[PDB]
Amino acid sequence: GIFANCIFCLKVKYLPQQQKKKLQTDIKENGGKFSASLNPQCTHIILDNADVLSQYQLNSIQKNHVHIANPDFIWKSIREKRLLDVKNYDPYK
């Protein structure tokens, strides 16, 4: 699937539970892995609009080349049946 070799940290606490779960199933059904925690193995961190990151988290993200994206990265990649440009979905840029 399109998310093969992707490891997503999900910070989507303020999404409806049904959307959190759809994110998870969309990731797993298309070859991805997801985690609640941020670590060096993460390739991506998905952040809903109301979730924020600490300076510590942002430094880890920079150091480990983690891509910061919003949920639309997942939704639209699934819809288009193709991994999109994550640079177009960065809430911090």
Residue numbers in the entry: 4 to 96
Paper excerpt:
pmcPARP4 is an ADP-ribosyltransferase (ART) that uses NAD+ as substrate to add ADP-ribose onto target proteins, a process called mono(ADP-ribosylation) or MARylation. PARP4 is also referred to as vault PARP since it can localize to the vault particle, a cytoplasmic ribonucleoprotein complex. PARP4 has a distinct domain composition relative to other PARP enzymes; however, the N-terminal region of PARP4 is homologous to a collection of domains found in PARP1, a regulator of multiple nuclear processes including the cellular response to DNA damage. Collectively, the study establishes the human PARP4 BRCT as a nucleic acid–binding module.
However, the location of Phe39 on the potential nucleic acid–binding surface was intriguing so we also considered Phe39 as a possibly important residue. Conservation analysis using ConSurf indicated that Phe39 is conserved in 77% of 150 PARP4 homologs. We mutated Phe39 to glutamine and to alanine to test the importance of this region. We determined X-ray structures of the four PARP4 BRCT domain mutants. As expected from thermal stability analysis, the overall BRCT fold was not affected by the different mutations, and superposition of the mutant structures with WT BRCT yielded RMSD values between 0.5 and 0.8 Å (comparing all 763–788 atoms). Mutants F39A and F39Q both led to a shift in the position of the sidechain of K23, which impacted the charge distribution at the structure surface beyond just the F39 location. The loop that bears residue F39 was repositioned in the F39Q mutant, whereas this loop did not change in the F39A mutant, thus leading to visible changes in the electrostatic surface potential. Relative to WT BRCT (0.5 ± 0.2 μM), mutants F39Q and F39A exhibited slightly weakened binding, with estimated KD values of 0.9 ± 0.5 μM and 0.6 ± 0.1 μM, respectively. Relative to WT BRCT (KD of 19 ± 4 μM), F39Q and F39A showed weakened binding with KD values of 35 ± 10 μM and 33 ± 2 μM, respectively. The TM of WT BRCT was measured as 51.6 °C ± 0.2 deg, whereas TM values of 54.7 °C ± 0.4 deg, 54.3 °C ± 1 deg, 58 °C ± 1 deg, and 60.0 °C ± 0.7 deg were obtained for BRCT mutants F39A, F39Q, K31Q, and K23/24Q, respectively.
